[PDB]
Amino acid sequence: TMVKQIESKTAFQKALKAAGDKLVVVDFSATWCGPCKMIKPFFHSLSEKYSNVIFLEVDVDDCQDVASECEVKCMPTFQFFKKGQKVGEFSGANKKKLEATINKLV
Numbered sequence: 223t224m225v226k227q228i229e230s231k232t233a234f235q236k237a238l239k240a241a242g243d244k245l246v247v248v249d250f251s252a253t254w255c256g257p258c259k260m261i262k263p264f265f266h267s268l269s270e271k272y273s274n275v276i277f278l279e280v281d282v283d284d285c286q287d288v289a290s291e292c293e294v295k296c297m298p299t300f301q302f303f304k305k306g307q308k309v310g311e312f313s314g315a316n317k318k319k320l321e322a323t324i325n326k327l328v
């Protein structure tokens with residue numbers, strides 16, 4: 223259990239800076255979203271397998287402001303960060319592409 227919930231743009235930007243030189247994975251999801259429910263367990267399992275990666279969760283229903291600014295059109299969308307920079311992104315509950323993108327950027 224290493225996934226921290228992001229409830230604000232304040233928290234988001236604080237979390238990104240707190241990350242330092244570590245890869246940051248953000249899961250944009252919703253509670254009513256089927257594909258999101260499928261991959262949620264795996265996303266969380268990945269958090270305590272990739273200890274040198276920072277895992278975050280954003281509920282797009284709570285943070286409609288942030289989801290817009292981040293250009294989430296559908297979920298789950300996964301967005302990847304290093305320093306203060308977006309270094310990767312895909313949308314889809316694709317277990318294979320998620321771990322692959324983690325490895326291709328850590």
Ligand SMILES: *SCCS(=O)(=O)O
Binds near residue numbers: 291292293301
């Ligand atoms: S996903 C982050 C959007 S913004 O705050 O960097 O513009």
